[PDB]
Amino acid sequence: GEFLATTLERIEKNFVITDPRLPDNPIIFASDSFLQLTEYSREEILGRNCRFLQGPETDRATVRKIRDAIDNQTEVTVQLINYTKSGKKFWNLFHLQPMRDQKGDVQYFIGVQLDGTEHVRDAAEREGVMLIKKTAENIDEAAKEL
Ligand SMILES: Cc1cc2nc3c(=O)[nH]c(=O)nc-3n(C[C@H](O)[C@H](O)[C@H](O)COP(=O)(O)O)c2cc1C
Ligand SMILES: [Ca+2]
Ligand SMILES: [Cl-]
């Protein structure tokens, strides 16, 4: 199909990279795993803001937490219900953080999704946050020279 995955998009994790310089802070990179999770083709989602993942049972207070982190240029970790292209629900243990350049300016945002079947707590929450934060750090390394 269109937009063959780059090497970075073949990293075996669900993530996207957005460019806040572009209209509506849209996706510019999306991993193959993210596409498999969400059922979209890459062409379908490039240039779009990630809010298409939200639907009727998505808690809007949790979306506001993400909105506020983006506008304060700071990280956040939350859990919220998201939807695939066909309307299948999944829980998303979600981590966002900015990627800074060598002047400390925000160049991209990185978002990492750990899909699950339930809201998690305790050990499953801790292990999931470990995984998505480590992944975000790895994508920070991977995306620094893009
Ligand atoms: C890098 C990045 C990744 C995002 N990933 C998700 C996601 O997995 N799920 C989601 O519901 N929102 C995600 N968002 C949040 C939305 O794109 C958007 O910021 C949120 O809906 C608040 O803005 P709005 O009020 O204009 O919709 C992501 C945002 C960014 C910048
Ligand atoms: Ca799942
Ligand atoms: Cl749990």
Author numbering: 401 to 546
The authors write:
Light-oxygen-voltage (LOV) proteins form a sensory photoreceptor class that elicit a wide palette of physiological responses to blue light across archaea, bacteria, protists, fungi, and plants. Likely via a radical-pair mechanism, T1 reacts within microseconds to the signaling state, characterized by a covalent thioadduct between a highly conserved cysteine residue in the LOV photosensor and the C4a atom of the flavin isoalloxazine ring system. Thioadduct formation entails a hybridization change of the flavin C4a atom from sp2 to sp3 and concomitant protonation of the adjacent N5 atom. A highly conserved glutamine residue in strand Iβ is situated immediately adjacent to the flavin and has been identified as instrumental in reading out the flavin N5 position and eliciting the downstream transitions.
To arrive at a molecular understanding, we solved the crystal structures of AsLOV2 wild-type and Q513L in the dark-adapted states to resolutions of 1.00 Å and 0.90 Å, respectively. The flavin pteridin moiety was coordinated by the asparagines N482 and N492, and the flavin O4 atom hydrogen-bonded to the amide NεH2 group of the conserved Q513. At the present high resolution, an alternate conformation could be resolved for the terminal turn of the Jα helix (residues 543-546), possibly reflecting the inherent equilibrium between folded and unfolded helical states. Crucially, the A’α helix is interlocked with the C-terminal part of Jα via the hydrophobic residues L408, I411, I539, A542, and L546.
